[PDB]
């Protein structure tokens, strides 16, 4: 006789108002897992990805991105929740995605997308996003195309080479000059053979890497 919570909004609505790591288990997820719950923006945000200081290596393969990786104890650690957990999370409810972005110049923006859904493994964790809102600009647009997740070892992009092999990261890739929040952690402006930093091109360039990123979700 144990109690399980489907996501962070159920935790917040049940009276837990403190931000931090909690155990949740989406309905069809076979096992519970630790997740960061951000309770500060009206409460009940389940953090699915975080970028903070460049500590974690995001240049991983398919199964690493499938299972999740990174730090799950530190308040400001970096992690990727995991594509299978993303699927189980988003399939149990209709969710809004919020992306909080910050600068190396004390500035912040955000983007919000309705109807955030990640498909199952057989469909390559396809990304579904709805209408855009916010202040960062919509960098996930080029009703959006339905793109599949790609890693260096599993190429599912619309580019001839391997997008994920060049950006050293997994993402829902289309053509590698789009936004990528799992890119290499640089300090603002950066130089390389490709734009493989953490980019939100509507706000900063394709050659300015952001300071912190928080991708979180909450029911609709
Ligand atoms: Ca390809």
Coordinates of C-alpha atoms and ligand atoms in Angstrom, one line a residue:
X1 CA 0.0 0.0 0.0
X2 CA 2.0 2.9 -1.4
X3 CA 0.8 6.1 -3.0
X4 CA 1.9 7.1 -6.5
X5 CA 1.7 10.4 -8.3
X6 CA 1.3 10.7 -12.1
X7 CA 3.3 13.9 -12.4
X8 CA 4.4 17.0 -10.5
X9 CA 1.0 18.8 -10.8
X10 CA -0.6 16.0 -8.8
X11 CA 2.1 16.5 -6.2
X12 CA 1.5 20.2 -6.0
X13 CA -2.3 20.0 -6.0
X14 CA -2.0 17.5 -3.0
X15 CA -0.3 20.1 -0.9
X16 CA 3.5 19.9 -1.5
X17 CA 4.6 23.4 -2.3
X18 CA 8.4 22.9 -2.2
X19 CA 10.4 22.7 -5.3
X20 CA 12.8 19.8 -5.6
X21 CA 13.2 16.1 -6.5
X22 CA 10.2 13.8 -6.2
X23 CA 9.3 10.2 -7.1
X24 CA 6.6 10.0 -9.8
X25 CA 5.2 7.3 -12.0
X26 CA 3.1 8.0 -15.0
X27 CA 0.3 5.6 -15.3
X28 CA 1.8 3.3 -18.0
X29 CA 5.4 3.7 -16.9
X30 CA 6.6 0.4 -15.5
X31 CA 8.6 2.0 -12.7
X32 CA 8.7 5.2 -10.7
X33 CA 11.6 7.6 -11.3
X34 CA 13.0 10.8 -9.7
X35 CA 12.1 14.1 -11.4
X36 CA 12.5 17.8 -10.5
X37 CA 9.2 19.5 -9.6
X38 CA 9.3 23.2 -10.1
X39 CA 6.5 24.7 -7.9
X40 CA 7.3 28.4 -8.5
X41 CA 5.4 29.4 -11.6
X42 CA 1.9 28.7 -10.4
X43 CA 3.1 25.2 -9.2
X44 CA 3.1 21.7 -10.5
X45 CA 5.7 21.8 -13.3
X46 CA 7.5 18.5 -14.2
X47 CA 11.0 19.3 -15.4
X48 CA 11.9 17.0 -18.3
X49 CA 15.3 18.6 -19.2
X50 CA 17.6 21.1 -17.6
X51 CA 20.8 22.9 -18.7
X52 CA 22.7 24.9 -16.1
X53 CA 26.5 24.9 -16.1
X54 CA 27.9 22.4 -18.6
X55 CA 28.5 19.6 -16.2
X56 CA 26.7 16.7 -18.0
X57 CA 27.7 15.3 -21.3
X58 CA 24.7 15.4 -23.8
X59 CA 26.6 13.7 -26.7
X60 CA 25.0 10.4 -26.0
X61 CA 23.6 7.5 -28.1
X62 CA 19.9 6.4 -28.6
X63 CA 19.5 4.2 -25.5
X64 CA 21.1 6.8 -23.2
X65 CA 18.6 9.3 -24.5
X66 CA 15.9 6.6 -24.3
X67 CA 16.6 5.8 -20.6
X68 CA 17.5 9.3 -19.3
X69 CA 20.8 10.6 -18.0
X70 CA 22.4 13.3 -15.9
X71 CA 22.2 14.4 -12.3
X72 CA 19.1 13.9 -10.2
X73 CA 20.1 15.2 -6.7
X74 CA 21.5 18.7 -7.2
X75 CA 19.1 21.6 -7.3
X76 CA 20.8 23.1 -10.4
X77 CA 22.1 19.9 -12.0
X78 CA 21.6 19.1 -15.6
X79 CA 19.6 16.1 -16.9
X80 CA 17.5 14.5 -19.6
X81 CA 14.4 12.7 -18.3
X82 CA 14.3 10.1 -21.0
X83 CA 12.3 9.6 -24.2
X84 CA 10.4 6.6 -22.8
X85 CA 9.5 8.5 -19.7
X86 CA 8.5 11.5 -21.9
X87 CA 6.2 9.2 -23.8
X88 CA 4.6 7.7 -20.7
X89 CA 4.3 11.2 -19.2
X90 CA 2.7 12.9 -22.2
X91 CA 0.4 10.0 -23.1
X92 CA -1.6 10.1 -19.8
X93 CA -2.9 13.7 -20.2
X94 CA -2.8 16.8 -22.4
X95 CA 0.2 18.9 -21.5
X96 CA 1.6 22.3 -22.1
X97 CA 5.4 22.6 -22.5
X98 CA 7.2 25.6 -21.1
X99 CA 10.8 26.4 -22.0
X100 CA 12.6 28.9 -19.7
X101 CA 15.8 30.3 -21.2
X102 CA 18.4 32.6 -19.7
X103 CA 21.3 34.7 -20.9
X104 CA 24.9 35.3 -19.8
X105 CA 23.7 38.9 -19.5
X106 CA 21.1 38.5 -16.7
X107 CA 18.2 38.2 -19.2
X108 CA 15.4 35.6 -19.5
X109 CA 12.8 34.5 -22.0
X110 CA 10.4 31.6 -22.4
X111 CA 8.4 29.8 -25.1
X112 CA 5.2 27.8 -24.4
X113 CA 3.6 25.2 -26.7
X114 CA 0.2 23.6 -26.2
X115 CA -0.5 19.9 -26.9
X116 CA 3.0 18.7 -26.1
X117 CA 3.2 15.0 -27.0
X118 CA 6.1 12.5 -27.5
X119 CA 5.4 9.4 -29.5
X120 CA 6.4 5.9 -28.6
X121 CA 9.6 4.0 -29.5
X122 CA 8.2 2.5 -32.7
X123 CA 7.5 5.9 -34.1
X124 CA 11.0 7.2 -32.9
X125 CA 9.6 9.4 -30.1
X126 CA 8.0 11.7 -32.6
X127 CA 7.6 15.3 -31.4
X128 CA 4.1 16.9 -31.4
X129 CA 3.7 20.6 -30.4
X130 CA 0.7 22.9 -30.6
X131 CA 0.3 26.7 -30.6
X132 CA 3.1 28.9 -29.6
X133 CA 3.1 31.7 -27.0
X134 CA 5.7 33.6 -25.1
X135 CA 8.6 36.0 -25.5
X136 CA 11.5 34.0 -26.8
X137 CA 10.2 33.6 -30.3
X138 CA 9.1 30.2 -31.8
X139 CA 12.3 28.5 -32.7
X140 CA 10.7 25.1 -33.0
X141 CA 8.8 26.1 -36.3
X142 CA 11.3 25.4 -39.1
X143 CA 0.6 23.3 -36.2
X144 CA 4.2 22.2 -36.6
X145 CA 5.9 19.5 -38.7
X146 CA 6.0 16.1 -36.9
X147 CA 9.7 15.4 -36.3
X148 CA 11.4 12.3 -35.0
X149 CA 14.2 12.0 -32.4
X150 CA 17.7 11.3 -33.7
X151 CA 21.1 10.3 -32.2
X152 CA 24.4 9.7 -33.8
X153 CA 23.7 5.9 -33.9
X154 CA 20.0 6.3 -35.0
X155 CA 19.6 8.7 -37.9
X156 CA 16.0 9.8 -38.5
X157 CA 16.4 13.3 -39.8
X158 CA 15.6 15.0 -43.2
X159 CA 19.3 15.7 -43.8
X160 CA 21.7 13.6 -46.0
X161 CA 24.4 13.2 -43.3
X162 CA 23.7 12.7 -39.6
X163 CA 22.4 15.9 -37.8
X164 CA 23.0 14.3 -34.4
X165 CA 26.5 13.3 -35.3
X166 CA 27.4 16.9 -36.1
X167 CA 25.6 18.7 -33.2
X168 CA 27.0 16.0 -30.8
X169 CA 23.5 15.7 -29.2
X170 CA 20.1 14.1 -29.6
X171 CA 17.1 16.2 -30.5
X172 CA 14.1 16.2 -32.7
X173 CA 16.1 17.1 -35.7
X174 CA 14.9 18.4 -39.1
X175 CA 17.9 20.1 -40.6
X176 CA 20.7 21.0 -38.3
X177 CA 20.4 24.8 -38.4
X178 CA 17.2 24.8 -36.2
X179 CA 17.0 25.2 -32.4
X180 CA 18.7 22.6 -30.2
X181 CA 18.5 22.8 -26.5
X182 CA 20.7 19.6 -25.9
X183 CA 23.7 21.1 -27.7
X184 CA 27.2 21.8 -26.4
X185 CA 27.4 24.2 -23.5
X186 CA 29.4 27.2 -24.5
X187 CA 29.6 30.6 -22.8
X188 CA 27.6 32.9 -25.1
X189 CA 29.2 33.6 -28.5
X190 CA 31.2 30.6 -29.7
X191 CA 33.1 29.2 -32.6
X192 CA 33.2 25.8 -34.1
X193 CA 32.8 24.0 -37.5
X194 CA 29.0 23.9 -36.9
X195 CA 26.3 25.7 -34.8
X196 CA 26.3 22.9 -32.2
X197 CA 25.7 25.0 -29.1
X198 CA 22.5 25.4 -27.1
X199 CA 20.6 27.7 -29.5
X200 CA 17.2 29.4 -29.5
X201 CA 17.7 31.3 -32.8
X202 CA 14.7 33.6 -32.5
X203 CA 16.3 35.2 -29.4
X204 CA 20.0 34.8 -29.8
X205 CA 21.8 33.7 -32.8
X206 CA 22.9 30.3 -34.0
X207 CA 26.3 31.2 -32.6
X208 CA 25.3 32.2 -29.0
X209 CA 24.9 29.4 -26.5
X210 CA 22.5 30.0 -23.6
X211 CA 23.3 30.0 -19.9
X212 CA 20.4 28.0 -18.6
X213 CA 17.5 26.1 -20.0
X214 CA 14.5 24.5 -18.2
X215 CA 12.0 22.4 -20.2
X216 CA 9.0 21.7 -18.0
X217 CA 5.4 20.5 -18.6
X218 CA 2.1 20.9 -16.9
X219 CA -1.5 19.6 -17.7
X220 CA -4.0 21.6 -19.8
Ligands
LIG1 CA1 20.0 11.5 -42.6

